[PDB]
């Protein structure tokens, strides 16, 4: 989860693409870190409203994948 850091480089990238520069969004995202292991579907809920619930599935899905996986390979 130092790749939660360089991850923050990722998340920042993808959302920044999907209007530019929005900050406290990105922070409501990563702000589910510190409960670590405990973050869930609800991420898709809250984030689901904040961005257009369409892109929602796309992102938070991709995330849950990279998180379960890079959660393994360590």
């Amino acid at each position: 989860a130092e790749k939660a850091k360089a991850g923050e480089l990722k998340v920042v990238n993808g959302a920044a693409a999907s209007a530019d520069q929005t900050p406290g969004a990105t922070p409501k995202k990563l702000s589910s870190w510190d409960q670590a292991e405990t973050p869930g579907h609800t991420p898709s809920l809250r984030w689901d409203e904040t961005p257009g619930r369409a892109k929602g599935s796309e992102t938070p899905g991709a995330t849950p994948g990279s998180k379960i996986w890079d959660p393994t390979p360590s």
Binding site: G40, H41, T42, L45
Partner: peptide, 12 residues
């Protein structure tokens, strides 16, 4: 179908 699944996880 999806949202009520997390709602039901909130239930139990």
């Amino acid at each position: 179908i999806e949202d009520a699944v997390s709602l039901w996880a909130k239930l139990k």
